[PDB]
Structure formats: C-alpha cells, structure tokens
Structure 1
Amino acid sequence: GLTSEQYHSQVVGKIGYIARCMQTIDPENNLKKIREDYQDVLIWAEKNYRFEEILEASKSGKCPNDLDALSRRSLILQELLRLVSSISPFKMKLDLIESQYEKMKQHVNLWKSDYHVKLNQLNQLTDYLKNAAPTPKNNFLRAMTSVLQMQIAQYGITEDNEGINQLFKLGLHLLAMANEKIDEQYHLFKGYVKDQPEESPFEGILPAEDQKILVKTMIDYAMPKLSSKVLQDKLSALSSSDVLTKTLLDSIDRIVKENEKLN
C-alpha cells in the first residue's frame, strides 16, 4: 500500500498527531491514565526530536511504528478529543473523561461504533449552529443543542441515556425540518419543553439574554393569534420573564386557548 519512506513518514506524522491531540485534550496534564497509556508515543514529542531524527528512529524500529496500531490508538484519542470539543463550553469531569476513554479503547471498532455516530450527530448540530443566523428554528436548535451538550458532559456518550437520545432525535428532526415550517418547528420545541422532566429546562444552561430571546420568540409566535386586549396585555407581561419555564409556556398556551374560546 504505502512505500517504505511514506510508511515511516506516516508513522512520524501519526506520532506527532497523537502528541498534538494529547496536548489539546489535556493541556494541564490531568489525564494521567491516558498519558500513561500513550507514554511510548508521547516520549518522542516530549523531547525536541526533529522530523528527520524521529523518522530515523521509526525506520530503526526504536519508536512505535506499527501504523495499524498507531492508527487505532490515534483514533481512540481523536474520538475522545472530538467528544471533549463538541461540548467545549461545558467541561467534563476527569473521571468521566477517563471512563469514556476506557470505553472507547475497549470498543472493537470505533469507526462503526454508536459513540462515533452520536458524536457525528452532535457535530452536525454544533457545525450548523456555528454559522446559522438567529431565527426561531436556529434559536430552538441552539437551546436544545446546548442542553444536549450539558447532558453529554454530565453523563457521557458511552451509555443509553434516554434524555440524550431524545435530544439527539429531536434536534436532528428539527435540523432536517424545512426552514419555512414555522408551525412544525414551534410545536416540536414545545413538545420537547413539555416532555423535559425539569420545569425550567434551559435555566442556567443558556445565558439570561438568550433565555430572554427564547421567551420573546415564543411570545412572538403566541401574539398574532390573540384577540382580547386584556389577555394580550397579560401575554406582554409574561414576555417580561427572563427565564423560560414549562409553566410559563403552559400559561401562554392557556392565554391563546381562552382567546380561541372567546372568538
């Protein structure tokens, strides 16, 4: 497949890439177990070997040069780094990181694992939200994805958490749902909010200002259906809330429903 010169160049590059991944995932040298497992390849990055010298070492066999084993180990580290990065703002406990590293290492084949698929879905959401402009769909997606990242950081991807699975399903469905289907987006978000066990799903997860924008969006969708000016003023008062709550959404729903009955 690869010529000897290119094979050993690949070995050197993979050692360097593993070193970079370790530096990015654990700059503070807190993941002692992982760094111990990767000691044989991180030794060549600790010392300032030049590319030529490390390539000579790889050719001589002194440094790890089984490109398949290096690929497996590099992937084990890279999937963990992707997991840590996809929840960047929400840090993950060292114990959780080490346990998930062990789970990934134990896995037979990462590139077909459920962890890899879950990371791919979370990365779909994160990438979309990295550039999408503020709209009802995008605000709903950002809220749900931030909650999903918090749940991932607090539990991890190496299990069958029903909450994380539900958030993945709903986030992907909303993402695939057309931009113009305002009603479907709003009802999907409303269903998610109503099905979250907590009364305030987004409290503390999103900033207070983004909370205000989310409640403002819900009020914007609620307002045009109202007819009574008194209930409209009640809705305006509710719009002053700084946090989204399940009971607040229920109150808005009841307001629009009495307006419907009065019609």
Structure 2
Amino acid sequence: YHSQVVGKIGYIARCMQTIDPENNLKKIREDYQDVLIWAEKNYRFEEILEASKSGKCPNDLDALSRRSLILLELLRLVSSISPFKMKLDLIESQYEKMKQHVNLWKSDYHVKLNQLNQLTDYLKNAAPTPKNNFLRAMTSVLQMQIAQYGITEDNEGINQLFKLGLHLLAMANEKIDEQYHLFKGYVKDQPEESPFEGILPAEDQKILVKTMIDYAMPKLSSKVLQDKLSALSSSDVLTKTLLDSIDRIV
C-alpha cells in the first residue's frame, strides 16, 4: 500500500525530472511539487512510507496511478515525437487538457499515441521494402505535423496519414502495387509541393523518387521514353510534377 505510493511518488518525481531538465513545466510541476519536494532532498523510503502512513503525503493509490498514468502518457507523447521538439506552452496546455478529462486509457490521445508508437516501433524493424520508406516518410511528416499541431486538436492530415500508415502497416510483402498506388495517390493528394522537404534527408527523397523511377522504369522499351524517364532519376526531391511527368510517359 505505502510502498506502491512511495514508488509512484518517486517515479513521478523521477519522470518529472527526466521529462525536462530545464524546469520549464511550472504548470504541471506546480501540482506535483509535493512529490518532487521529497525527491529533491535526501529522504529514505522508510521516511516516505512513515510520512505517508502519518498523513503527511498522498496515500491514494487510484489518484497516484491516474496521475502517474497521465504523466506517463504525457511523457510518452513527448518522447514519441522524436527527433522533433514541441512547444513548451503546448505541452502544458496538452497536459492541462488531458488532466481535465475523466478517461485516460481509452481516449483519442492514447489511441493516437499508440497508433504513432506502433508505426514508430515498426519503423525500427521493417524489412527492405518501399512500404517502410514511405511509412517512414509519412511517419516523419506525421511526426512533424503531430509536433506542430499537438495531440488534442483534430487534423485531416494526421488522420489521413495515420490511416495510410495503419493501412500500410497491415499490408504484406505481396502488395507493392497497392503501396505504390497508395503512395502515388497520397503524394498526389497533398497540397504542398514537397512533403519531405525540410524533414527528411536528400537520400531518403532520392530513394523515394528512385522507387517510383524504378517501378515505372521497367515498362517502356523506347529510347525516347527511357531517355526522358531517366532524366527524372537525378532529382533530390519528390514533387507532383515528377509524378505527373512519370505518369504521362507511362
């Protein structure tokens, strides 16, 4: 009873100190100052258990598990947006918006954090296929849009990128035509000129253009078609004009 509250109190202060080492979360750290005060000083576990048994600290296992689950959800949401960095006020507004909700294990933030964590966890063990590169670029643009727009607000690009990454994650190795058509439709449906510019490296966009150039490359035997198709394999960025020029040649 008291050991779980002491471990949750020490894990709350250790997670709060490991969340930000600059001390920028004064709003979220203001409510947890009673747990960080015992962690910022030389206090043994017997003094924390004796203080919790004497009514000098929090003794609610359900409230400490709910606040530790909310702080673990905020730390998992801030850690899942790597290698990007969100705003300081956006983390306090997202923590204040998540603290104002009664449910914290079946909400849209936990399903979106688990959905982004499934593609981010699957991105480190994917095989050599184009679905891992397109899902890596869409997970990078979805990570930049999730870091820019947050997890509490709604966005059509985050839902379309999460639905495209979730549908591409369930696909097998025999659906390269559906992943190439879904990547061509997702690249053609984007309003921006470059969805991978300023987020991924030039080799990742060159591999994505080389994937479509290699896929559309074994379909012509003419010198004029292969000569015009070979000129698009030297660009370091992917655009809709290259997909329209590649679709016009095929």
- TM-score interval for Structure 1 and Structure 2 normalised by the shorter chain: over 0.9
For structure 2, the 5+ residue unaligned runs are none
Number of equivalences? 250
Distance 2:105 2:91 in 1: 19
SS at match of 2:217: helix
Residues 10-45 of structure 1, C-alpha deviations (whole Å, 9 max, x = no match) = 001111111122122212111111111211111111
Q: CA deviation at 1:248?
A: 1.4
Residue 235 of structure 1 and its aligned partner are, at CA, apart by: 1.8
1:81 alignment partner, SS class? helix
Aligned residue number for residue 96 of structure 1: 90
Identity value in percent: 100
Aligned to 1:212, the other structure's residue is in SS state helix
Instruction: Please give the alpha-carbon distance, in whole angstroms, between the structure 2 residues aligned to 1:23 and 1:183.
Output: 48
After the TM superposition, list the runs of 4 or more consecutive aligned residues in structure 1 that deviate by more than 6 angstroms: none
Deviates more, 1:245-254 or 1:106-115: 245-254
State the shift of 1:57 in Å: 1.6
CA drift of 1:52 comes to 2.3
Q: Which runs of 5+ in 1 are unaligned?
A: 1-6, 257-263
Separation in 2 of the partners of 1:53 and 1:208? 56
* C-alpha deviation, 1:53, in angstroms: 2.1
2:89 aligned with 1:86, yes or no? no
| d(CA) in 1 for partners of 2:77, 2:172 | 28
Q: Which has the higher helix share?
A: 1
Matched, 1:252 2:246: yes
Provide Cα deviations, 1:108-144, integer angstroms capped at 9, x if missing partner.
1110111111111001100000121332111111011
Task: Tell me how far apart the structure 1 counterparts of residues 184 and 129 of structure 2 sit (CA, whole Å).
Answer: 16
Q: Does 246-255 or 104-113 show the bigger shift?
A: 246-255
Task: Tell me how far 1:245 sits from its aligned partner.
Answer: 1.1
Task: Please name the residue that 2:184 is paired with.
Answer: 190
- 218-227 or 169-178: bigger deviation: 218-227
Q: 1:254 and 1:52, CA in 2 relative to 1: closer, same or farther beyond 3 A? A: same
Q: Secondary structure at the match of 2:235?
A: coil
- TM normalised by structure 2 equals 0.96
Deviation at 1:94, TM superposition (A): 0.6
Partner residue in 2 for 1:211: 205
**How far apart are the structure 2 equivalents of 1:98 and 1:252?**
46
Q: How does 1:228-247 map to 2 (within 5 A)?
A: 228-247=222-241
- Report the Cα distance in structure 1 between the residues aligned to 2:173 and 2:21, rounded to whole angstroms: 40
Q: 1:155 aligns with which of 149, 152, 166?
A: 149
CA RMSD, aligned part only?
1.2
